[PDB]
Amino acid sequence: MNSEEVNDIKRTWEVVAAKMTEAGVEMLKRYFKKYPHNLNHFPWFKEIPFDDLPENARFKTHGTRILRQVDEGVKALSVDFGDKKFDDVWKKLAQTHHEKKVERRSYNELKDIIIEVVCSCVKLNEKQVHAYHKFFDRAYDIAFAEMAKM
Ligand code: HEM
């Protein structure tokens, strides 16, 4: 991970961090619309008609919480992911998510969406899209290595 790539992820991410709840709702409703199978992991959310979800309290709150943990990841991001504080964030995900058997594919599908919603807030170029993928790849690689114990 570059020095220009780290700074690009920080500069652009601030724009999304300014409106966490509005971005989180957008993120979750694209995600469940485009990948409806992932609804099975959230029993409480299928119990509700789809067009009613955006305006549901547990649903806005949960969107925000996903992005606020991502926020911490971006803050501890250094060149070549050199700062152990980065591993911290995603070891914390490991111990929160290990209890469900959510498989790798499901996390990849969410990355697709998160990365798309950032695009709709700020215009990324190819190099910045590329760097956002390496970010989440690395976060996911850390999380799963830690879940491999259990
Ligand atoms: C970017 C990757 C992800 C991050 C940063 C993230 C973050 C979080 C956070 C912050 C919580 C809240 C825990 C609490 O309230 O104490 C949570 C819970 C949860 N996560 Fe994720 N998550 C990610 C990916 C996923 C994926 C892909 C799934 C499966 C579709 C998933 C399933 C769940 C479920 C079912 C809960 C419990 C919801 C609840 O009880 O309200 N997570 N996660």
Automatic annotation (TrEMBL):
The keyword Transport applies. Pfam families: Globin (PF00042). Residues 1-148 form the Globin domain. Heme b binds at R58, R65, H97. It comes from the Eukaryota. InterPro entries: Globin, Globin-like_sf, Globin/Proto, Mb-like_M. GO terms for molecular function: heme binding; metal ion binding; oxygen binding; oxygen carrier activity. The keyword Nucleus does not apply. Keywords: Heme, Iron, Metal-binding, Oxygen transport, Transport. Belongs to the globin family. This is Hemoglobin. It comes from Gasterophilus intestinalis (Horse bot fly).
